[PDB]
């Protein structure tokens, strides 16, 4: 909606990325966004203010400003925040938890102590929403209305891919697209190191490697063909590419990426088990 | 230019990718493009014809049609093609070799036997030009005019990144952005396998992993910050991402990507040494 | 009506003769095979089939219309010296030897008669069950009809296609050596079944049937082997867990290593032969 | 000349395995496609479209599949089996043979669910694989408490029309899952890598795929038709000092054999682990 007001409890990296994406998309004017942090001297806080976002140290003011309320504090702080603002949740509120691991059940339990039927949505997104190319999934809670999920999807589709999932997939999504950008940043640093080793200036190597990864990812998104088929399509017999693919295989490249998704997913599950405990 | 006619000797994967990119960009109408192959029954040939590209089995007709002439046959076939069409090169022609490894010197030597001052440009591009997100470098030959390089850059910038380089960087670029898409396809297959292992449907895992890589690459292209800093920015203390980055490091992930760039570059150098020999 | 000869009466002569006779393209007694050692198990098996056996390579040549060279590669030049004067204009000489070039064969035979009809092939032992994988390249003087005849004959015992000669050493590393990679894999898969509680006989049968069915699936599908693997592997399931442990050992790289090592050894041996 | 003229077959679940089995049965000529019904809550699946083109009858309602069928294949994911049994348990009649295809799921668990509605359900548990689609599957089955002797013979007749089929004790089926259930995926991985090897050494990709697949097919057929040990068949390929023995050495140096043992073990153990989780629920 044009009248919709959005708030962020937690004015850090993710609040900045989403606010920048939303305002770049034009789906929200910056003045319709309020964010709160217990430290008005942060870099993200100053960046948000320059964009035109309203800032406050008082989470209650963010709640009173907002229709859609994003929880963008660290997961261990979620229970603290819900106890602080629980009595301020109203019927109009859609509470959107961005925290890794934290279950809809745990959120609904804390909030229902103050007012029955909190409308809760859980999402897992990632930092590339800042360039409107995020990957977002969401699950709807017990009292979320049908239009609540559609509203969520409309908003988050403005900054990237967005689809509804069952909540029990979100920890695995965290391991894949939540942590995914960090795998790519690591890969791009190393690819640039390889370019530099073979004689390219570092700035050109970074640009070429990032462009290669962006273009390849877009090709796969626009293709019906299997990634293995696209692999087959880009390796000439006896050529340079198939020689490089062999050295990746000899190091177990594929297994390392499987290891990574698994380790991030398992850590996410472990953190939440400690929270519930 | 609007009057410019473009030809491809070799109507295979790369000719299709460039022709699709050029026509999607609107910089060339398909009817201004001619491509030739000794087998009019190929899949790429049929795809090119549906787009509106002119096709012929006779390389001489492609030469007579064209102002800009792309050589898109395999590197070992370049010398054969130059001997076949050498007497047909005219003053108006810009000969653009896309072949990995093949030097401007070797091309100019073959063509100068027929007519002095062939205008030659060497490029290294990649398949994502098909979605207008290629990575292209080019080097200008002895008799290339100044406007020849600018024309080249204008044309190839319509389908992705394009910059001029010294020719002695092109074999390293091949190892990085030429082979790069294949590294990404391999990585995306493995990331999807990881998503599937942790419980995601395969189609969703492929979509999320590709979107993660696309978004991360775009973030780096739009950032002044170091990829290591972006890595630092997306890993919370004690969190899922830093746990996954550790298992990548324990397998030497970075070294495998360095190995790959090196192996592709070295194979490219080795193939050309065999050609010159 | 075709008379076929094998110089060499070993494993490949036996496999091809068994395949050809099971296909009904040749009567066993229209095949003649020669070896200097008639006390071999392969010779005893050829004899039981009804194949004609002789110690004299000249007799095999004079009997034959199509002449297969089925001796070890380092024996090929000795054979060509021995019976080169006996090659007639009617002969089609089919070298099965790994690595040995058409050029090397034609150089020897052309010193006797000027236009020897030479075909080079690379096949494999599953011709014995009519599921071989065969490629061939035609020599300088081989007629178009010679290639067509070769393809009809070798298609009776499996897949067969013409290739450029410069691919044959790589084919050797893939489908020539391939059956041995498969036998090794099947032994290990059976060991895995036995470790998890299956009787050996059942584990061997199930593993071999799994491999046969999967290979036939791929041959009958237009889909990529990665997509076929996706149709097996359910999210969180048993197969994707097993695929991970294969990946962690670099399973794919070992098979690439194998094809490469077989191809390179083939090229290296021929390099030695050309030097000598 | 086999044909079950009085047999109606149903599939609960219209996914990969339902398609593969229906394609194999119809290609074998033992069943007409219109005597097969399959149900699924998602009628926009590619597998559903393929079944429709074969002539298979399709419905969203599992009760209709039950009422149509004599032999009822359960072809849903293992964690969905208990929900299915609660849904159509009251619809099971004396005539039904319930054939569970689900990995891990025990006859005991199926019989307990169905027995709450009607005593003596006839249950058979099987483990098959996708190559039934080309009639070269590998299938094992175990008969349940109330299955008649004719039930097992009938199912062996049906499943033998699409590949190898043999009766086993149920305690072997999780290990079979790790070997021939997951087996085709090991083969697809191996064939992709073998083709990568052929391409590295200069072969066109299409030829490399064809040759590698044919090599694996022929070798598997050789072993199935031979009385000799796989090591002896390997000895007939490898000449002294030759190309093959050089390649086998590099496989050995990487522990190739151990990886395939690891795979069978990992798939079997995961199958057991998943069922232990189901029993705890
Ligand atoms: N950055 C990422 O890559 C993604 C982050 N997330 C989730 O988003 C949440 C935050 O992520 P980041 O923004 O990276 O953390 P961050 O640490 O950059 O920002 C956290 C913010 O919370 C503020 N804060 C701390 N205590 C507070 C309180 N009592 N009341 C209000 N604000 C308070 C801090 O001052 C800081 O501004 C976490 O739950 C994380 O799981 C999920 C997807 C990806
Ligand atoms: N595909 C890629 O990833 C990239 C390819 N390249 C270069 O582009 C060139 C071709 O690449 P692909 O298109 O992938 O090869 P491709 O094999 O798909 O197409 C090659 C084309 O050449 C044709 N051809 C063969 N002999 C010919 C002749 N005598 N006259 C005319 N056409 C003939 C073939 O019929 C085929 O259509 C190579 O030199 C390669 O190094 C460079 C950058 C990346
Ligand atoms: N066994 C296989 O898997 C395949 C073999 N080949 C090729 O087939 C040829 C033979 O291979 P195998 O049959 O495996 O070897 P093998 O050693 O089983 O048979 C070789 C035969 O040549 C005979 N021989 C030795 N000196 C002779 C002479 N002077 N005149 C006539 N015969 C003589 C030996 O007695 C022996 O019977 C080799 O060149 C090999 O590269 C190619 C494809 C597959
Ligand atoms: N795919 C394989 O390689 C093999 C699979 N199996 C077993 O076969 C069963 C199915 O395997 P796939 O067909 O590969 O799964 P799949 O996921 O392709 O098909 C599953 C089907 O179940 C349907 N479904 C979900 N809930 C349902 C409900 N309440 N009522 C009816 N249908 C419902 C889905 O829509 C889908 O059509 C699993 O239990 C698996 O263990 C066993 C051997 C091999
Ligand atoms: O030569 C080629 O086309 C390349 C290959 O190795 O596939 C693409 C970059 C080198
Ligand atoms: O909790 C977080 O913010 C994540 C991290 O591990 O950095 C990003 C995805 C999990
Ligand atoms: O349950 C299944 O479908 C299997 C899997 O791993 O997905 C195939 C054999 C086990
Ligand atoms: O020469 C031979 O017989 C071969 C070997 O490795 O021995 C089989 C394919 C090469």
From Swiss-Prot, chains A, B:
UniProt-listed PANTHER family: PYRROLINE-5-CARBOXYLATE REDUCTASE, PYRROLINE-5-CARBOXYLATE REDUCTASE 1, MITOCHONDRIAL
Pathway note: Amino-acid biosynthesis; L-proline biosynthesis; L-proline from L-glutamate 5-semialdehyde: step 1/1
Biological process terms in GO annotation: cellular response to oxidative stress; L-proline biosynthetic process; negative regulation of oxidative stress-induced neuron intrinsic apoptotic signaling pathway; proline biosynthetic process; regulation of mitochondrial membrane potential
Keyword Phosphoprotein: yes
Binding site for NADP(+): 9-14, 37, 59, 72-75, 98-100
Intracellular or extracellular location(s): Mitochondrion
Top-level EC class: oxidoreductase
Family classification: Belongs to the pyrroline-5-carboxylate reductase family.
Record's disease association: Cutis laxa, autosomal recessive, 2B: A disorder characterized by an excessive congenital skin wrinkling, a large fontanelle with delayed closure, a typical facial appearance with downslanting palpebral fissures, a general connective tissue weakness, and varying degrees of growth and developmental delay and neurological abnormalities. Patients do not manifest metabolic abnormalities. Cutis laxa, autosomal recessive, 3B: A disorder characterized by an aged appearance with distinctive facial features, sparse hair, ophthalmologic abnormalities, intrauterine growth retardation, and cutis laxa.
Residues annotated as binding L-proline: 167, 240-241
Function as written in the Swiss-Prot or TrEMBL entry: Oxidoreductase that catalyzes the last step in proline biosynthesis, which corresponds to the reduction of pyrroline-5-carboxylate to L-proline using NAD(P)H. At physiologic concentrations, has higher specific activity in the presence of NADH. Involved in the cellular response to oxidative stress.
EC number(s) reported in the record: 1.5.1.2
Reported regulation of activity: Subject to competitive inhibition by the reaction product proline. Subject to competitive inhibition by stearoyl coenzyme A.
Subunit details: Homodecamer; composed of 5 homodimers. Interacts with LTO1.
Modified sites of kind N-acetylserine: 5
Organism: Homo sapiens
Protein name: Pyrroline-5-carboxylate reductase 1, mitochondrial
GO terms for cellular component: mitochondrial matrix; mitochondrion
Residues noted as binding NADPH in the record, renumbered to the chain: 11, 13-14, 37, 39, 59, 73-74, 100, 233
HAMAP family linked to this entry: P5C_reductase (MF_01925)
Alphabetical UniProt keywords: Acetylation, Amino-acid biosynthesis, Disease variant, Mitochondrion, NADP, Oxidoreductase, Phosphoprotein, Proline biosynthesis, Stress response
Catalytic activity: L-proline + NADP(+) = (S)-1-pyrroline-5-carboxylate + NADPH + 2 H(+); L-proline + NAD(+) = (S)-1-pyrroline-5-carboxylate + NADH + 2 H(+)
Annotated GO MF terms: identical protein binding; pyrroline-5-carboxylate reductase activity
S-S bonds: none
InterPro entries assigned: 6-PGluconate_DH-like_C_sf, NAD(P)-bd_dom_sf, P5C_Rdtase_cat_N, P5CR-like_CS, P5CR_dimer, Pyrroline-COOH_reductase
